[PDB]
Amino acid sequence: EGYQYRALYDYKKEREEDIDLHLGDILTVNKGSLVALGFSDGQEARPEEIGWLNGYNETTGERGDFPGTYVEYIGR
């Protein structure tokens, strides 16, 4: 239930709002928490053209926002 992507790049938890991303990580970004900004029906599947997405990195058991370009939506 939500758009889950894969970590294409590695990011370092810099801002207290972003989290730690690493190639091979799994980001569980719900569908509402993502459209909570106003995206369009279909943008949720475009982290590179989305900007930032709040997902759950199960690999690190952490939750927060991250650079969408460093991910790759792959499905639910």
From Swiss-Prot:
TM spans (from-to): none
Post-translational modification: Polyubiquitinated in T-cells by CBLB; which does not promote proteasomal degradation but impairs association with CD28 and CD3Z upon T-cell activation. In adipose tissue, polyubiquitinated by the BCR(KBTBD2) E3 ubiquitin ligase complex; recognized by KBTBD2 through the SH2 domains, undergoes 'Lys-48'-linked polyubiquitination leading to its degradation.
Domain SH3: 1-76
Expression (tissue specificity): Isoform 2 is expressed in skeletal muscle and brain, and at lower levels in kidney and cardiac muscle. Isoform 2 and isoform 4 are present in skeletal muscle (at protein level).
Assembly notes: Heterodimer of a regulatory subunit PIK3R1 and a p110 catalytic subunit (PIK3CA, PIK3CB or PIK3CD). Interacts (via SH2 domains) with CCDC88A/GIV (tyrosine-phosphorylated form); the interaction enables recruitment of PIK3R1 to the EGFR receptor, enhancing PI3K activity and cell migration. Interacts (via SH2 domain) with CSF1R (tyrosine phosphorylated). Interacts with PIK3R2; the interaction is dissociated in an insulin-dependent manner.
Function: Binds to activated (phosphorylated) protein-Tyr kinases, through its SH2 domain, and acts as an adapter, mediating the association of the p110 catalytic unit to the plasma membrane. Necessary for the insulin-stimulated increase in glucose uptake and glycogen synthesis in insulin-sensitive tissues. Plays an important role in signaling in response to FGFR1, FGFR2, FGFR3, FGFR4, KITLG/SCF, KIT, PDGFRA and PDGFRB. Likewise, plays a role in ITGB2 signaling.
Entry remark concerning the domains of this protein: The SH3 domain mediates the binding to CBLB, and to HIV-1 Nef.
Sequence similarity: Belongs to the PI3K p85 subunit family.
Disease the record associates with this protein: Agammaglobulinemia 7, autosomal recessive: A primary immunodeficiency characterized by profoundly low or absent serum antibodies and low or absent circulating B-cells due to an early block of B-cell development. Affected individuals develop severe infections in the first years of life.
Protein name (record): Phosphatidylinositol 3-kinase regulatory subunit alpha
Lineage: Eukaryota, Metazoa, Chordata, Craniata, Vertebrata
Gene: PIK3R1
